[PDB]
Design a protein around this ligand. Structure first.
Ligand SMILES: Nc1ncnc2c1ncn2[C@@H]1O[C@H](COP(=O)(O)OP(=O)(O)OP(=O)(O)O)[C@@H](O)[C@H]1O
Ligand SMILES: [Cl-]
Ligand SMILES: [Cl-]
Ligand SMILES: [Cs+]
Ligand SMILES: [Cs+]
Ligand SMILES: [Mg+2]
Ligand SMILES: [Mg+2]
Length: 543
């Protein structure tokens, strides 16, 4: 019933809602349109948009776009597309750059109130002074000179980086971040949304609260990196309430949840850019990646992603999440909705000496535990392919599959036993085998049942598939902090096998998610699969 599970945040909202602190609840999701979103961002998406719906409130999608150098509209697009794919419906699609004129008016007021000033000092010198707790020489400049200099910065008289505007708070403040933090910088560079209008851009610490305030956000939800940043957030709110058309009340407040860190995966933009550019991975939608794009392409359903996020909870509890966990939620999400078909990944041929012609078998798509009914014609014939790995000349103790004195059950059809093994070049190339005569939907006459069941497909009927077998992207549980990050890659992240799958798949809609028995879950890769050249990704293996 509650999309977001119980925690400090639900409680806090519920309290303030009931006590009339705010009329409606207003969250935002605010990413930077300068990259693609990943599984970590999903936590912020489910949280922020989830509360809006859980409590009959609003949630804005807003591109926090104050860094013109890197930011592109295609990232804005991609962001909106992944947000909706997760199933969420932003109340508004907003861009912080539409706020600039208001933010600039706000800076004027700061300066008229003697609350900001222009700093001519170079960057290196400014941080030595901050480190020393000393004031800029320029700090006690006048309202008049500051407005003229700020205007001269607006005009783009000064080059990129050369002057900045800073609030006047306390140069010796114990919170280092309150030492006259920077409000405005100079970048002679055009913005993807608003163009060549501005040469002065605000810093995060100043624009973010103001975007919040402007939108009447009630609960601005951020991850825990903004711990010491909270004090400046309040400072901007408090010195500007009821100014330049801002409300005097109510006002937004920050609250902090733990960012997701998932085992076996890196989420930092730096490292991700590394992997794409250096061709370690094929592209931003690569199913090896934890981008939302890549998880989509992989076959993961948005419902598993939401559920994953929901399942794991919202807290201050920055404990790393095990990939085991994620994999199990995918498996669980696909269990009742993935019809079971049969395909072969490492094909090995088996010829049946005591069988001729064809015959077609009603086979169930759903196992006993799944309430769905559904059936399909499964072709059988004297030539099949089985997994190479379901055959031993030298089987171990447990061996439940096919061997030189061990019968086996072909799933949904006959028991066969081995008769001859043709070898060529040391390794095995074709099985010669026999059906045990009355074993279609029945045991052998002699009572010695087959120890196990293996999957198979008719070599006379089956479709070629390119299988893209995905694993975790790293071997080590902790790649994101571990030292050599590229030395921890899993060489098995992608194996590509050429294989076979039963012909029925051809009569299914392209977006079907299948369970290949004893193999894992699978679906047509949305980019490269074609009906005449099938390509299927393994979404996840079995438990
Ligand atoms: N792994 C994660 N788990 C939870 N939230 C995240 C994660 N990564 C990013 N977010 C949050 O989603 C929002 C937008 O993400 P985006 O990456 O554009 O912002 P950002 O400026 O890179 O944030 P950060 O610098 O904290 O990663 C931010 O609130 C951000 O902290
Ligand atoms: Cl049928
Ligand atoms: Cl069976
Ligand atoms: Cs940031
Ligand atoms: Cs069933
Ligand atoms: Mg960042
Ligand atoms: Mg980022």
């Amino acid at each position: 019933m509650g999309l977001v599970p119980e925690c400090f945040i639900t409680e806090l909202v519920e309290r303030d809602l009931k006590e009339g602190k705010y009329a409606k609840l207003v969250t935002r999701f605010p990413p930077e349109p300068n990259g693609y979103l990943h599984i970590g961002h999903a936590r912020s998406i489910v949280l922020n948009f989830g509360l809006a719906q859980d409590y009959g409130g609003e949630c804005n999608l807003r591109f926090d776009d104050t860094n013109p150098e890197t930011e592109k509209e295609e990232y804005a697009r991609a962001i909106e597309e992944d947000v909706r794919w997760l199933g969420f419906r932003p109340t508004r699609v907003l861009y912080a750059s539409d706020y600039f004129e208001t933010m600039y008016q706000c800076a004027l007021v700061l300066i008229q109130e003697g609350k900001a000033y222009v700093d001519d000092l170079p960057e290196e010198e400014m941080s030595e002074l901050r480190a020393q707790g000393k004031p800029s020489p320029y700090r006690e400049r006048s309202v008049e000179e500051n407005l003229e200099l700020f205007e001269r910065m607006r005009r783009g008289e000064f080059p990129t980086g050369s002057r900045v505007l800073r609030a006047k708070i306390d140069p010796a403040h114990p919170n280092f971040k309150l030492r006259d933090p920077v409000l405005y910088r100079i970048v002679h560079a055009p913005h993807y949304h608003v163009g060549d209008r501005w040469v002065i851009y605000p810093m995060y610490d100043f624009a973010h609260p103001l975007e919040d305030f402007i939108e009447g956000v009630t609960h601005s939800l951020c991850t825990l990196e903004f711990e010491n940043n909270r004090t400046v957030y309040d400072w901007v709110i408090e010195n500007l309430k009821g100014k330049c058309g801002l409300p005097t009340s109510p006002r937004p407040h920050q609250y902090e949840f733990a960012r997701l860190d998932l085992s076996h995966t890196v989420l930092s933009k730096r490292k991700l850019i590394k992997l794409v550019e250096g061709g370690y991975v094929s592209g931003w939608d690569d199913p090896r990646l934890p981008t939302l794009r890549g998880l989509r392409r992989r076959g993961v359903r948005p419902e598993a992603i939401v559920e994953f996020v929901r399942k794991t909870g919202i807290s201050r509890n920055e404990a790393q999440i095990e990939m085991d966990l994620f994999e199990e939620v995918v498996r669980d999400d696909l269990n009742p909705i993935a019809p079971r078909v049969l395909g072969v990944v490492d094909p090995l041929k088996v010829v049946l000496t005591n069988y001729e012609g064809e015959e077609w078998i009603e086979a169930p798509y759903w196992p006993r535990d799944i309430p769905k009914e559904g059936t399909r014609p499964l072709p059988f014939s004297p030539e099949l392919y089985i997994e190479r790995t379901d055959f031993s000349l030298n089987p171990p103790k447990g061996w439940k599959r096919l061997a030189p004195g061990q019968r086996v059950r072909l799933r949904h059809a006959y028991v066969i036993e081995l008769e001859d093994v043709v070898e060529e070049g040391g390794e095995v190339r074709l099985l010669k085998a026999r059906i045990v005569p009355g074993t279609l939907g029945a045991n052998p006459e002699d009572g010695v049942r087959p120890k196990g069941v293996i999957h198979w497909v008719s070599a006379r009927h089956a479709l070629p598939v390119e299988f893209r077998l995905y694993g975790r992207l790293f071997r080590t549980k902790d790649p994101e902090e571990g030292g050599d990050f590229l030395q921890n890659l899993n060489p098995e992240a992608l194996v590509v096998k050429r294989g076979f799958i039963e012909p029925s798949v051809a009569q299914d809609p392209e977006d079907t998610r299948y369970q290949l028995e004893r193999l894992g879950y699978f679906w047509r890769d949305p980019v490269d699969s074609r009906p005449e050249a099938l390509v299927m990704n393994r979404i996840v293996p079995l438990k």
